[PDB]
Amino acid sequence: RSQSEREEEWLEKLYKKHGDDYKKMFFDKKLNIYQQSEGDLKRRLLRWKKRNG
Amino acid sequence: MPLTAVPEPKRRFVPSKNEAKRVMKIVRAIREGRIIPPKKLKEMKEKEKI
Amino acid sequence: EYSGIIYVSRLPHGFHEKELSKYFAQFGDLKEVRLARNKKTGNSRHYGFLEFVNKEDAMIAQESMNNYLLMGHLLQVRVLPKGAKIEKLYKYKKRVLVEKGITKPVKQLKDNMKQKHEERIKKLAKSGIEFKW
Amino acid sequence: FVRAESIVAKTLATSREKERIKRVSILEDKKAKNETQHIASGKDFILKITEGLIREKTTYDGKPALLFIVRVRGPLAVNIPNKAFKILSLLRLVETNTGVFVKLTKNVYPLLKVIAPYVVIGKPSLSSIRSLIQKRGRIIYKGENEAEPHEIVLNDNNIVEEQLGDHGIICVEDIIHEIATMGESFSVCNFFLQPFKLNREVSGFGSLNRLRKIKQREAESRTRQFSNAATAPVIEVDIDSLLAKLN
Amino acid sequence: RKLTRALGRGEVSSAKRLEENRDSYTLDHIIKERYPSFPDAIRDIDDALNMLFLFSNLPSTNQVSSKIINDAQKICNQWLAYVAKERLVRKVFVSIKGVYYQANIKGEEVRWLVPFKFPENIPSDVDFRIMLTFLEFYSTLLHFVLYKLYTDSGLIYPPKLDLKKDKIISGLSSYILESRYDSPVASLFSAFVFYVSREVPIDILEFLILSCGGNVISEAAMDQIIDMSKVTHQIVDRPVLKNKVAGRTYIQPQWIF
Amino acid sequence: AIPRERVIKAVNELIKFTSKPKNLLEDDEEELKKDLQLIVVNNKSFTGTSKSFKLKLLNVKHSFYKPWKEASATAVKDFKVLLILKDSDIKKVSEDDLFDQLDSEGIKVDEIICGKDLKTVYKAYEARNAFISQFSLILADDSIVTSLPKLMGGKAYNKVETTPISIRTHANKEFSLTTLTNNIKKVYMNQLPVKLPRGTTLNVHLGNLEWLRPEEFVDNVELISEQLIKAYQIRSIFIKTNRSPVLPLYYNQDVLDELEDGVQVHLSTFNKGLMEIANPSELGSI
Amino acid sequence: AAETFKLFNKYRPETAAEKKERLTKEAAAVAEGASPKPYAVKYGLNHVVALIENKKAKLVLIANDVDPIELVVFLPALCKKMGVPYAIVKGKARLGTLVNQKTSAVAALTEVRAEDEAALAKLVSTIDANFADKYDEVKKHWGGGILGNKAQAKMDKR
RNA sequence: CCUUCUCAAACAUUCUGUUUGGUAGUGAGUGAUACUCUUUGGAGUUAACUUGAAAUUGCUGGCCUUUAGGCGAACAAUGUUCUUAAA
């Protein structure tokens, strides 16, 4: 089960702006358009990192 | 105070999800050539009617 | 009982004596129309009074415009009790300033400034401040 | 019956227009006396609007020009003040959808800044002048024996020779020459032709005509712009295309 | 009905959408069955041209719009330009009603009336509701006939409009005829250059001179924002002339007629 | 002009006087008791006989809004900055651009509004007052300022901090971010605004006594007074904290010496244009 | 009624064609390579009733010509009990124009743009003064006792 | 049931800089510290604060031109007039 292109770009932006700070990615109004909990962000970002490196 | 204490759903605070799915469906139709984009359509109506 | 005078309030901008008279002359003959204005500059105070020749015309004029939503305002029209004359509502205009004075000679005017300075210096001595010159 | 909102709106809009005219008049009075020290701008600007719609902001010369002024309907809920009405009355422009030929000079320019919202101005071409005179030509000519004020069409050159023959004008095509090129007898024929009766762009209130009116008004917010300022430039447009619409 | 419903509901975007999505009728098959062959079209072109030339010289009003008159004028100018280019004018007659021109189109005699370019007085008696339908039929008839005539002669159709020359006079000369005689009338005025004055109507005289083989230097064409080098004639209409320079021949319009 | 020792002693005496000696939050009297003001009076009105809504910007050596914003951290009301821009120039600049070219200097533009916002969303008097009264520095585009008094009302111009300051935002007749940023910095840390009244008395708000050091205040007074001397005919200058007796600083009597027919009928220019468009010359002259 | 429909016509919902065009523009932008919450008039009987009992509607317009009249008989009482401003507006076909439907039994305003917040409050006050406080005593009286001429002549006179 | 002056110059090249000019407000109500003039009647200025676009009657400011205008414009100046925003 692989991610989509737009999701990968969104996670790209999140990682490049905040890194591993999930609390700031949770409270960001420009990148977290659909307000998503820290757990979901961490899980999706971990999948993205595992696929890329 | 209101009649019931039902919690507020999360879909009332974030952008629409049904419209997101519909937009992505239109994107998929555009990429397959089934839907001509509005710019290309505007181009085709300025080339024949003469 | 009641009078023929209606008091109108919460008037929008640009609804003055002439406009009030022109609008309210369609409810009957008018006898006096006055609007409250600022004395220093001619500007509507957003209320006024006006009297009908027919007392029963004021009731109709009050029942149809007492809660009129006009220009974002809720007009408040009400009939005054028996008697209750309207007076002392002048139509003021913007007061321009006149530059007049300097009646005193320049010598006395210049000499008074020195003594004003000395009295000002002496004044602050009694207020717990030491200041020289 | 007259509703209160109409009266209030008329008062407010006319008060705004009156202040506009007073500001323009004070500025022109200051410029005329060469007292340009505490004024916003001392330059006579002209804005040329042409259709993807571009604007040219150019300084007006002293050179006389030929203008065709068309009387359009002014701002809504506005009673025409004394200054603008006087200027439009000497121009014989009170009826809407009506045009007149004027010679722009250094003294005509301040007048065009007072009546700007009520008129549309620009420089006509020779073909426009010819078609306008040959399709809409009117004269106040005597009737059978008594009735003078008949306004009749220019069908023959006999009446022109009778009226303007002394100045050397014997035909309509000589009026066209004296108007296209401002000659010695420009005024005599200009006040002989009388204002032109033009055709309104959209005329009707059916659904098709109502939506034509909507589309025509929507384009009027981009072509006839008025800044409501003392230093507003005189707006000049393409009269050839407009007269193509109005002929 | 649907457009009226759209506006009556206060929804203007759908009204614009409705007007965008509409198609009108076309009279192509009707013209084909009325005139199975081109000669029949040339037979009815007489009255077709009469109606079009009437509408060309007409002010726009509430009923007849500016675009209708502009289309009629464009068709009339194209027809005149073709007839002048091919030099087909055979007869002319100046009357109190207008000017009658008779030309030789494909072996047929075609006579049409052009009114004088003067302001018209529209009577409220007439019904323009009928004349508009007649004009609608005639305009399509001329569109097809003009296409056929231009393409048979190798000319390009529709002719390119010279916007620079259209702003001064706006007549038949405004249309330039690109590409891709048998009568003495077509050879007259061949080695002639006419100086048309202001008094004489240029519209009904340049057409006649060009259709014979002459050249026109109109005096009315120098009023916008040459010097008469090769002129051999001059058409005047003043009671008394002023210059009277040697060499030229001074004539009245009727000579051409 | 004014000897430095007199200004230094005046500031020291005002500092000593201002602090001679239940409530949770300080009231208006206590909050602004330490505000410093310089009164300048000339002969006749400052701006002639015409009301001037423009602010004169006097150059200061030490920044006036930097200690204000620094000391606004422990205050109930923050120090906010409003930037009013033209309709066409509202999309050419974003908060990110001003953040990039202003954070390096310490300046933050809190809000960026257009002239269209002053007539749609802040049209109501209460909403307009609530929005405007939260800003301490309002920078308006040079082109849009002249139409601001109607859009911002009259209560905005009753104070010095709520009335707009005209700054240039156009280079070579086009919008340039460099000009806007340079003017923002210039106003923020090189100038001080003052209203010019049509009376004799003028008040310059030098700021709270707790912001700048006494020498930092005497160095600004010595310069502001010099500029006002050079620009006008000012006859006296006083210094005071609010609700305090005035301390004389400058005194100059030498200014009080400045208190004691047929066709052509010479018709006006308006009538000169009228005469060119009408043939029946019928002017009512004489 | 004329002032109420000037505010309610500025929050008319998008039609099908406009919404489709807006979504296709976004789709075409995405196919090559942060928005605020929308504002519109709320309609539908169940939706508006749910809004009223949650105290979210700022103003509720109720049509007076619903053919099964029992569909809206409880609505004025529910609006008054729950403290929601309401107004009975003449014409169910007129409420559908601002909804893009042929008819609409009800309409409502839940959220309004900050430019029109003052206008909605002024309209609510106007309706409170003109409609609620004016009819609240005669609203609870039996109506329809109109007498004809041939009947009033023989009963009221005799 | 209208919709608000959205800029001009002059000098100089540091992708721009300096100087000059341009801005007349909803009303009502609190509130000091001070300044100038005065015909000693108040005229013009000086902190700060409250508010649904809120409302219950302040005798009549002065000069000029008239038959309402200017003092922000003096041989200067004034809306009830446009009507296809019709019916």
DSSP string, D164-232: HGGGT--SHHHHHHHHHTT-TTHHHHHHHH--EE---S----SHHHHHHHHHHHHHHHHHS----STTP
Which two tokens mark E124?
A: 């409220």
CB atoms within 10 A of CB D166: 10
Write the CB contacts of E198 (distance below 8 Å, at least 6 apart in sequence): D171, D173, D174, D176, D177, E219, E220
For residue G75, CA distances in Å to F7, G88, G107 come to 75, 10, 12
CA–CA separation, C51 vs C46, rounded Å? 17
Residue E219 three-state SS: helix
CA–CA separation, A14 vs A40, rounded Å? 13
DSSP string of F220-264, one letter each residue = HHHHHHHHHHHHS-EEEEEEEETTS--EEEEE-GGGGGG---TT-
By C1' distance from the Cα of D40, the closest nucleotide is H22
E interface with G, Cβ–Cβ below 8 Å? 9-11, 13-14, 17
Q: Which ranges of chain F does DSSP label H, i.e. alpha helix?
A: 4-18, 28-31, 65-71, 95-102, 125-132, 148-152, 177-190, 214-231, 269-275
Which two tokens mark F133?
A: 């009264």
CA–CA separation, E189 vs E87, rounded Å? 12
Amino acid identity for residue C59 in this structure: M
For residue D234, CA distances in Å to D47, D56, D58, D62, D230 come to 6, 11, 10, 14, 11
For residue E232, CA distances in Å to E194, E239, E245 come to 6, 21, 11
CA–CA separation, F25 vs F30, rounded Å? 9
CA–CA separation, A41 vs A47, rounded Å? 10
Nearest-5° angle of CA F56, CA F195, CA F121?
100
Which two tokens mark D2?
A: 């007259």
Amino acid identity for residue E253 in this structure: P
Superfamily grouping for domain G1-148 = Ribosomal protein L30/S12 (3.30.1330.30)
CB of E152 less than 8 A from some CB of D: no
CA–CA separation, D107 vs F155, rounded Å? 42
**Torsional sign, CA E155, E159, E161, E165:** positive
For residue D31, CA distances in Å to D25, D64, E141 come to 10, 19, 62
Beta strands in G19-101 (DSSP E): 42-43, 59-63, 86-89
Largest Cα–Cα separation, chain A:
28
The CA distance from A16 to the nearest CA of chain B, in Å, is: 23
Which two tokens mark E28?
A: 């192509």
For residue C21, CA distances in Å to C10, C51, C52 come to 16, 10, 11
Nearest-5° angle of CA C91, CA C93, CA C94?
155
Quick check: G85 and G123 in contact, CB under 8 A? no
Which residue, F226, F240, F187, F219, is CA-closest to F66? F187
CA–CA separation, D72 vs D119, rounded Å? 5
* Residues paired with residue F53 on neighbouring β-strands, in sequence order: none
Which nucleotides on chain H have any atom < 7 A from a protein Cβ? 1-9, 13, 15-18, 21-28, 32-39, 42-62, 68, 70-73, 75-86
Largest Cα–Cα separation, chain F:
87
- Which helix (H) or strand (E) segment holds residue G57: the answer is none
Largest Cα–Cα separation, chain B:
67
CA–CA separation, E105 vs E48, rounded Å? 14
D202 burial type by CB count under 10 A (0-12 exposed, 13-18 middle, 19+ buried): middle
Which residue, D62, D107, D91, D109, is CA-closest to D235? D109
Which two tokens mark C15?
A: 């609804």
- Which helix (H) or strand (E) segment holds residue F36: the answer is strand F35-42
Q: Which ranges of chain E does DSSP label H, i.e. alpha helix?
A: 2-8, 12-20, 28-34, 38-56, 66-86, 128-152, 163-166, 203-210
Which residue, E108, B21, C19, is CA-closest to D5? C19
Which two tokens mark F271?
A: 């009538």
CA–CA separation, E55 vs E63, rounded Å? 13
> What are the respective helix, strand and coil percentages of chain C, to the nearest 5?
35, 25, 45
Helix D157-164 × helix D172-180 angle, to 10°: 60
Which residue, E171, E217, E211, E176, is CA-closest to E193? E217
Nearest-5° angle of CA D120, CA D122, CA D128?
110
Quickly give D49 CA vs H79 C1' distance in Å. Answer: 30
Q: Find how far residue C24's CA is from the centre of its chain.
A: 22
Nearest-5° angle of CA F209, CA F214, CA F215?
145
CB atoms within 10 A of CB A36: 15
For residue B4, CA distances in Å to B8, G50, G53, G78 come to 11, 11, 9, 15
Nearest-5° angle of CA G133, CA G9, CA G114?
80
CA–CA separation, C107 vs C92, rounded Å? 40
Which two tokens mark E236?
A: 């005047």
| DSSP single-letter state for residue E179 | B
**Nearest residue by alpha-carbon distance to C1' of H56:** C7
Q: Which residue has the tokens 């509409």?
A: E22
CB atoms within 10 A of CB D235: 22
Chains that touch D (3 or more CB pairs under 8 A): C, E, F
CA–CA separation, F242 vs F257, rounded Å? 32
CA–CA separation, E93 vs E101, rounded Å? 7
Quick check: F189 and F81 in contact, CB under 8 A? no
- Which helix (H) or strand (E) segment holds residue D9: the answer is helix D4-32
Amino acid identity for residue D213 in this structure: K
CA–CA separation, G107 vs G89, rounded Å? 10
Question: Which chain G residues are Cβ-neighbours of E11 within 8 angstroms?
Answer: 15, 97, 100
CB atoms within 10 A of CB F211: 21
C13 burial type by CB count under 10 A (0-12 exposed, 13-18 middle, 19+ buried): middle
CA–CA separation, E117 vs E234, rounded Å? 22
Residue F89 three-state SS: coil
Quickly give C40 CA vs H60 C1' distance in Å. Answer: 14
If phi over 0 gives left and psi between -120 and 50 gives alpha, with beta otherwise, what is residue G68?
beta
CA–CA separation, D30 vs F36, rounded Å? 42
For residue G82, CA distances in Å to E182, G49, G51, G56, G70 come to 98, 11, 11, 10, 19
For residue G8, CA distances in Å to E22, E124, E151, G49, G98 come to 32, 46, 61, 18, 7
Which residue, C23, F133, E14, is CA-closest to G17? E14
Quick check: E139 and E129 in contact, CB under 8 A? no
Which residue, G103, G88, G4, is CA-closest to G44? G103
CB of C133 less than 8 A from some CB of F: yes
CA–CA separation, E109 vs E83, rounded Å? 13
Residue E129 three-state SS: helix
Query: How many interchain CB pairs under 8 A, F with G?
Result: 12
Quickly give G120 CA vs H62 C1' distance in Å. Answer: 48
**Torsional sign, CA F202, F208, F211, F212:** positive
Question: Which chain D residues are Cβ-neighbours of F273 within 8 angstroms?
Answer: 107-111
If phi over 0 gives left and psi between -120 and 50 gives alpha, with beta otherwise, what is residue D118?
alpha
- Which helix (H) or strand (E) segment holds residue F155: the answer is none
Amino acid identity for residue A21 in this structure: D
CA–CA separation, C90 vs F199, rounded Å? 28
G interface with E, Cβ–Cβ below 8 Å? 9, 15, 17-18, 97-98, 100
A interface with G, Cβ–Cβ below 8 Å? 6, 29-30, 33
CA–CA separation, G80 vs G53, rounded Å? 11
Quickly give E10 CA vs H6 C1' distance in Å. Answer: 33
Helix D186-193 × helix D157-164 angle, to 10°: 130
CA–CA separation, E109 vs G43, rounded Å? 72
CA–CA separation, F6 vs C131, rounded Å? 9
Contact G118 F123 (CB under 8 A): yes
Question: Which chain E residues are Cβ-neighbours of G18 within 8 angstroms?
Answer: 13
Q: For A34, list phi and psi in degrees, rounded to 5.
A: -85, 105
CB of G116 less than 8 A from some CB of B: no
Strand F81-85 with F137-141, pairing: parallel
Q: Which of G6, G15, G99 to mutate to test the interface with E (most CBs of E within 10 A)?
A: G15
Which residue, F104, F114, F122, is CA-closest to F184? F104
- Which helix (H) or strand (E) segment holds residue D61: the answer is none
In C, minimum Cα distance to G7 occurs at: C72
Write the CB contacts of B6 (distance below 8 Å, at least 6 apart in sequence): none
Strand F234-241 with F35-42, pairing: antiparallel
Write the CB contacts of D5 (distance below 8 Å, at least 6 apart in sequence): C70, C71
Largest Cα–Cα separation, chain G:
88
DSSP string of D18-57, one letter each residue = HHHHHHHHHHHHHHHTT-TTSSS----EEEEEE---EEEE
CA–CA separation, D164 vs F220, rounded Å? 80
CB atoms within 10 A of CB D195: 19
Which residue, F33, F17, F10, F39, is CA-closest to F243? F33
Write the CB contacts of C112 (distance below 8 Å, at least 6 apart in sequence): none
The CA distance from C85 to the nearest CA of chain F, in Å, is: 34
- Which helix (H) or strand (E) segment holds residue A40: the answer is helix A38-52
In C, minimum Cα distance to G134 occurs at: C67
D residues 145..164 contacting F (CB < 8 A): none
Sketch the domain layout of chain G as residue ranges. 1-148
Tell me which residue range forms the domain holding D34.
1-247
* Residues paired with residue C30 on neighbouring β-strands, in sequence order: C52
If phi over 0 gives left and psi between -120 and 50 gives alpha, with beta otherwise, what is residue E155?
beta
Which residue, E240, E226, E241, is CA-closest to E193? E226
**Domain tally for chain D?**
1
Question: Which chain G residues are Cβ-neighbours of B39 within 8 angstroms?
Answer: 28
Which residue, E97, E70, E68, E88, is CA-closest to E186? E88
Q: Which ranges of D33-123 does DSSP label H, i.e. alpha helix?
A: 82-90, 108-112
Beta strands in F44-110 (DSSP E): 55-59, 81-85
CB of A4 less than 8 A from some CB of B: no
Quick one: CA torsion of F6, F12, F13, F18, rounded to 10 degrees? 140
Which residue, F249, F251, F187, F233, is CA-closest to F37? F249
CA–CA separation, D217 vs C9, rounded Å? 38
- Which helix (H) or strand (E) segment holds residue E59: the answer is none
Which two tokens mark G73?
A: 């008989």
Q: For B23, list phi and psi in degrees, rounded to 5.
A: -60, -40
CB atoms within 10 A of CB E114: 21
The strand order across the sheet containing E193-196 reads E215-216, E193-196, E233-235, E249-251
In A, minimum Cα distance to G31 occurs at: A6
CA–CA separation, D161 vs D171, rounded Å? 7
Quick one: CA torsion of F13, F19, F21, F25, rounded to 10 degrees? 170
Nearest-5° angle of CA F162, CA F165, CA F170?
145
By C1' distance from the Cα of D5, the closest nucleotide is H1
CB atoms within 10 A of CB D231: 17
CA–CA separation, D1 vs D28, rounded Å? 41
Quick check: E13 and G18 in contact, CB under 8 A? yes
E96-102: list long-range contacts, CB under 8 Å, 24+ apart.
E99/E204, E101/E207
CA–CA separation, D65 vs E142, rounded Å? 41
